[PDB]
Amino acid sequence: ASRLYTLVLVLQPQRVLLGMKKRGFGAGRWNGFGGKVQEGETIEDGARRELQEESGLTVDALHKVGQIVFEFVGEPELMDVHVFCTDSIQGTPVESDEMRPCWFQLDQIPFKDMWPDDSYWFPLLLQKKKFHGYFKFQGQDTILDYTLREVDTV
Ligand SMILES: Nc1nc(NC2CC2)cc(N2CCN(C3COC3)CC2)n1
């Protein structure tokens, strides 16, 4: 049994949009935009909703680029994160109560202040390769095990 989450990366030729999480789970780390998928909405509906809630942005089309399953020691529910990419967005990103957005050059991605797993799978994101990932965490900082592979269908 697993819970559905979304993660949206606005990735452009020279820059990627990241948000500084201001509260809740993962506060103090840069990440893409997303959250829990609700009842009554598709996964992509949920990605669009969290994107707009956290940045004010809307998008024409979201592309599926990955899936990452996380296990936390002692926690019965697996986290099933569906990762999406878009290039062109509608609007200018602005700060919300949950996220402070900034553009990062692709050689200045702040991996030190991101979830540790990002260092493993962001390269595949940057190569526009579709991937499946699995990470086993002890707490929030320690990766105990992981698998990562390119796939044909996300
Ligand atoms: N880049 C990245 N890494 C993660 N690592 C696992 C935690 C160890 C999780 C993650 N997402 C799952 C959580 N979700 C939170 C913001 O509200 C829920 C954002 C996207 N995104």
Known binding residue 118? Answer is yes
For residue 55, give both structure tokens.
Answer: 């940045």
Q: What letter does residue 38 receive in the DSSP assignment? A: P
Q: How many CB atoms lie within 10 A of CB 68?
A: 23
For residue 11, give both structure tokens.
Answer: 């990735």
For residue 40, give both structure tokens.
Answer: 């009554």
Query: Minimal CA–CA distance to 46: which of 83, 2, 101, 95?
Result: 83
For residue 133, give both structure tokens.
Answer: 């990932």
CA dist 37 and 45 (Å) reads 8
> In ligand 1, which atom is closest to the CA atom of 34?
19
Which residues lie closer than 8 Å to 44 by C-beta, 6 or more apart? 6, 62, 84
Q: Classify each residue of 27-41 as buried b or exposed e, where b means 16 or more C-beta atoms within 10 Å of its C-beta.
A: eebbbbbbbebeeee
Query: Which amino acids bring their CB within 6 angstroms of ligand 1?
Result: 5, 7, 25-26, 31, 34-35, 70, 79, 81, 115, 117-118, 137
Q: What letter does residue 112 receive in the DSSP assignment? A: G
Q: How far from chain centre, in Å, is Cα 36?
A: 11
- Please report, as a single letter, which amino acid is at residue 67: Q
Query: Minimal CA–CA distance to 47: which of 77, 22, 83?
Result: 83
For a mutational test of ligand 1's pocket, the pick from 31, 50, 72, i.e. the residue with the most ligand atoms closer than 8 A to its C-beta, is 31
Rg, the chain, Cα only: 15
Experimental determination approach used = X-ray
Which residues precede a break in the chain, with C-to-N distance above 2.5 Å? none
Three-state secondary structure call for residue 61: coil
CB-CB contact of 121 with 68 (8 Å):
yes
CA dist 24 and 137 (Å) reads 18
| Resolution, Å (one decimal) | 2.1
CA dist 22 and 20 (Å) reads 6
Query: Minimal CA–CA distance to 52: which of 94, 16, 80?
Result: 94
Greatest alpha-carbon span in the chain? 41
In the beta sheet, which residues pair with residue 104? 16
Known binding residue 150? Answer is no
* Ramachandran sector of residue 91 (left: φ over 0; alpha: ψ -120 to 50; beta: rest): left
CA dist 22 and 92 (Å) reads 19
